[PDB]
Design a protein around this nucleic acid. Sequence first.
DNA 1: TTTCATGCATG
DNA 2: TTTCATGCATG
Lengths: 259, 257
Amino acid sequence: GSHMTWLSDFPQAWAETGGMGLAVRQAPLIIPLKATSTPVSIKQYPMSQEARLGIKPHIQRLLDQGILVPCQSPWNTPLLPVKKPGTNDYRPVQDLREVNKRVEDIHPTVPNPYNLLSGLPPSHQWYTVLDLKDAFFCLRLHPTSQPLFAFEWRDPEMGISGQLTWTRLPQGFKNSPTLFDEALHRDLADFRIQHPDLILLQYVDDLLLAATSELDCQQGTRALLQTLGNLGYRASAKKAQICQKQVKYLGYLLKEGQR
Amino acid sequence: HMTWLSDFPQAWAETGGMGLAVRQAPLIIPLKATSTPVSIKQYPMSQEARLGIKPHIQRLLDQGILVPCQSPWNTPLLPVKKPGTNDYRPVQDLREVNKRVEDIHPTVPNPYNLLSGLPPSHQWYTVLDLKDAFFCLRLHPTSQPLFAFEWRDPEMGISGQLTWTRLPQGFKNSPTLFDEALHRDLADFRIQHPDLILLQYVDDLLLAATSELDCQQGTRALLQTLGNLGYRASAKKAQICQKQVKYLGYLLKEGQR
DNA sequence: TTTCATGCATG
DNA sequence: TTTCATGCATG
């Protein structure tokens, strides 16, 4: 009915009103390195405070959430302050290229879009699209593993004087997409069995549910949201697509036709 | 029983390693208005002291419970003994810290004054204590500095001081902060199981149920909740669904001890 | 359509 | 196991 009916009836699931997610059934991830890689410490390109504090709030919510924590490893990558053109709208992009080229490489395992969507029968024509905000942060990076992603950052005001590292899957990592998509596939393994009349599509952090009735869809969406909630994930309510007869899933479009 | 081991990985400690409260955020430690960092010198140790104690901190750095640091604070780290040939436990004299730290009204209940409430209707108990409960809670990087302590050693490449990332053992408000938190989270469990009696004294817990049956669902529901919350309890020590159990020094059949 | 770097695939 | 240049995504 109202977006808020869904929002209020399931605050545990939504990212907006429900705290940052964290895959609870998911063990810390180890990041196996290439048979012979060795720590490489790239240096932080001189950064103009004008831009540092322009990106500081970003590091803050992360430092506070414990997703970014102090440390000191022989690894190091540059933090690149990316300013959206024509706006003091700064955001950090870690250049994890070196690290990436020393970390063993995992083969992808992602359902090419098109096909995946093609298998969906005319029977199920009520869709629900959801995208788990901050999907990678939901996955814990094993202890003995975070040193790799360390980037230099000093803030007396935050008890940081050297470098932070991640405790979750950081954007910019190459195996991040295939690892997550897999864990989520593993956490929705049960859910799909629970609902043999629903079709559950997922591309890493993008999910689509299709039912034969708006009701079956609604109920399916509840059981759905609720399963992600307790699991630790968090759906984006602003970009939520709720029991609708037509939706955009993966740059695609879907009720009685196509793109 | 060899079924609880295997049906609840996350609940127990043995099948779910060190815990972590996915619902509680890193804690900032409000310092006393007059407080100012304190540098207490490190009482030198004998190689045997260092030795024994060494592995300890090691397990710690690896697990990320310790981080190098150059803090103005510094507390001594006493080498502790026990009988046999060589057996120590790191103990940091966090006293000088606890004094400058701003304390907090004690939420922790009175041992006995607690069990008292236990209704004779529930003669079915389950007692499962929590393992490394404090480290399930973590420190903000801003509040870590206080807890910093000395350790010059290549073995792990330290020259500086080490500090804590989780509520440390020895801090005046730890028992109050953990109990307060576990209580915080475990709230809904209660509302969801009204006809189930849950007693919690810091990291020790006693679930009470009316019937053996009732007691099972209780324990399951609980273990299930300790998991997804980030709490690991010693399955070893655990006493599941028993008419007679022992909890908080005080034993329980009908009367007690 | 970047307060940077750049591997890639493209002509 | 290349034989130069370069826009454009991605770190």
